[PDB]
Symmetry: C3
Amino acid sequence: TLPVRLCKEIELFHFDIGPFENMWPGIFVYMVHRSCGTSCFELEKLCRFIMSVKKNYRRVPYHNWKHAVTVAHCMYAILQNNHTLFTDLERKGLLIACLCHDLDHRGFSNSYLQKFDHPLAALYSTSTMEQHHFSQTVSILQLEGHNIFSTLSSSEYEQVLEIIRKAIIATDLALYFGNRKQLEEMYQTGSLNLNNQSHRDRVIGLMMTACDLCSVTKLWPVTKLTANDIYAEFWAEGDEMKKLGIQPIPMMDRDKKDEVPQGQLGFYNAVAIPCYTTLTQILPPTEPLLKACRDNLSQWEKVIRGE
Amino acid sequence: TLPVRLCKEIELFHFDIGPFENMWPGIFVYMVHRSCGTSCFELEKLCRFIMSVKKNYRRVPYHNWKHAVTVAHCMYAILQNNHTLFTDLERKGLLIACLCHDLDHRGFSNSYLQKFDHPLAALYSTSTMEQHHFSQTVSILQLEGHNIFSTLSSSEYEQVLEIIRKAIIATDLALYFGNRKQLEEMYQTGSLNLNNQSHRDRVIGLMMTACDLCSVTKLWPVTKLTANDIYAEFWAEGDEMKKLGIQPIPMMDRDKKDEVPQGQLGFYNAVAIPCYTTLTQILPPTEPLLKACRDNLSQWEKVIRGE
Amino acid sequence: TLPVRLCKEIELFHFDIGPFENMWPGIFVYMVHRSCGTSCFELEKLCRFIMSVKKNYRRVPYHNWKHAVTVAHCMYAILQNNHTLFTDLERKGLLIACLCHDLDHRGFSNSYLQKFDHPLAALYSTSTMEQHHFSQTVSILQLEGHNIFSTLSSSEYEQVLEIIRKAIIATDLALYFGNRKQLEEMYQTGSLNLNNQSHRDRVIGLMMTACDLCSVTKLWPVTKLTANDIYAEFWAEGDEMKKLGIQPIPMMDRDKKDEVPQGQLGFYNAVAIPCYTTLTQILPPTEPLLKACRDNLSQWEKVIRGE
Ligand SMILES: COc1nc2cccnc2n1[C@H]1C[C@H](Nc2nc3ccccc3s2)C1
Ligand SMILES: COc1nc2cccnc2n1[C@H]1C[C@H](Nc2nc3ccccc3s2)C1
Ligand SMILES: COc1nc2cccnc2n1[C@H]1C[C@H](Nc2nc3ccccc3s2)C1
Ligand SMILES: [Zn+2]
Ligand SMILES: [Zn+2]
Ligand SMILES: [Zn+2]
Ligand SMILES: [Zn+2]
Ligand SMILES: [Zn+2]
Ligand SMILES: [Zn+2]
């Protein structure tokens, strides 16, 4: 258990995990215990696993340890408000997947790695960083005393690793557009069926996108401050693009700061609002994420106007 | 001994310890040896103690290792210019107290810890961080080979730990206002008596405030640059307050930068000038701190005007 | 071998080593193998040496590990395009010298160390930091399993250490002006002779300056961004000068930012263009460095105008 205020507010979708890093591991363990149960993991193994995962996130402005636990919390909130839908293994796997989904991130996009000709791009032609995140996850699990899935049968172990793999790959935003489009069609026609594994994998994929982007679903003061972190990374990549003799897209171009308000508008309209609209259609109890997304859209519109 | 320039200028109240971190331990050892004597501490134990204290200060903009040694230097200057007043134990304890007085500081105020519902606030209802600083000090002393007070009698050990405890607690600025007010009254009436232990504890408390705030007693270029560090911390806390859904006070509000000159004025008038005025009354050789404080007040007045 | 793009573009003088730190060691090993040969160093010893050198560079804005490898690359490009001129030992020694030439740099100039009265200034009256860089190099070589020159004869070992010493000392820009002037005279009169050791030492000295300053020979986007790093250091030193009660020169004065374009002009005209002009005269295949320097001069002239 946690302090009184945290216990209460952790159940809210728009919860912020706070600036005290050494409380984040305990926040995660709390979430796991309420989501899966106190006997889902051996506590000693789990804590060892969490600290090794922490050590393999880098000190970058956005794709860091705080992001990992923040993404995990959003998944916790989704799971707790749709608690009859998911199995034991899925709850286990998804929280872990979220915690590990950006492991060893450098603060650079897949396209930058390709243009730089980074060895990872030679190894992984598609979803380069995401395949690397999964590879890192697996490597940590293979460390002595780190296999938190020790007590599972081989059959169950293979299932949860596949849940984790698919989920981490789904955080490649390039795959989200096609996935969301398919889910929309299946929802409208009544074809969508959570008993169908391929349909289920898609819904989980959308859940992963929703959690990954959850910065846009916090209250305005948090959403606005987090934007500074995201652009710190993007502008750094844009600097590196210019060093390769390539003009970066405006989003990554430090010199085009004034276009931020309009750029944000475009993203909410093109990416965020559709993501949470579709997720809310499929899983109605995720409605608060959509409301908060809409509220942040209203705030960016006011910045553009000058209010 | 130190380089020629340092030897000379370390005796000045407005000395700056410089940007070379690995010289700060030697600066402290120099001060201890001149203040208490070369046989006050076993050198090997003292160096081990200093390095563990350094390791338990965090990389924050202001409440860091540099602040700790800077505070210790101000106490050194007070002690050397009032050298007949204090006992062996008090000189020992006060330098150590100053070095440890912000141990494990996160860069957040007591009020923020309370509002966040941080576990330390549940443990320590009053002077939350200061009670924690003392707890940290004690923990370091209990480490193998770290008890720098090994050679003291039990009686003396208990006295110096109490000197340290009271001194560290006195750095809670919330307790300064009441303390200064009492000292003022006792000074005016002739009641004040350094042979009275409770009166003595108050004077030491004021000395601790004076050392803690000594940023405002450096020369203008140092005082102005240090302000950047202090606001880096304050504005970060104000950001966190906004993330809890609480509007921070203007001092901690990044958006109210233009109010800095006037805010500083208010602090010098309400806090700093009274502190050093009262200290100078009680201990006349601390006069240079008051003069330099007044000079910085004049500089902030010129910023407001535009000069 | 390296990724395809790196293999190709590493041969260009204006190559940028990129933002992936863990590739820099492999970039260096690649350069050594192509420059000297695959049997010049025992690979295990070399990698151990490289990692210890990395550990002894500090996290400062400019005089860091990236600068060290960048300087080494420029020397690689000079060596590969003048491949018949230099001996086995010289190629070995110069790459190593470049990698170690700023070892343990604090981000402060020799003059600041003198004014602060830093112990290094008492030890080394001339070329203070450069003598320290060499001392650090030697200390690393003396570590167990770190003597990468193990297989050399004593005679050869002494020669390469002297090559390294002279080369590192030559990176003291204060010595460059006199050296360049002498080389100019010897070139014009036909006196200059690479078979004369003292003349040869001078030419190597100029090569070291050219590599050290090679920031001004990159493409404009790299050159412009690197300027931010250099001023971060300079302005920090200027801050420290003000803390000693000394007005810093405008270059190190944060308050005189607007003078950057004109200040840069002056440096290109007074230092950079003459350096690469003289180097190109002596070693014609280094011409691309001069062209790129001239192009950056044109860019700074356009900043001044407003284009
Ligand atoms: C893919 O872009 C983003 N991913 C995000 C994840 C969390 C929060 N925001 C995210 N964003 C973008 C950043 C903004 N989009 C743009 N900003 C600019 C700025 C300047 C010029 C063009 C653009 S597009 C939303
Ligand atoms: C408690 O405030 C401070 N503690 C200090 C310790 C050392 C040096 N300065 C200290 N200060 C304050 C910072 C300033 N006071 C204020 N600044 C502002 C800025 C904006 C709006 C209101 C205020 S009050 C003196
Ligand atoms: C010695 O100065 C420099 N060393 C450099 C090495 C690499 C790249 N640039 C270097 N520079 C200087 C920085 C600039 N010179 C000046 N800048 C200013 C700025 C303000 C006022 C005076 C000056 S001189 C070239
Ligand atoms: Zn990702
Ligand atoms: Zn992510
Ligand atoms: Zn404090
Ligand atoms: Zn303090
Ligand atoms: Zn140097
Ligand atoms: Zn250098």
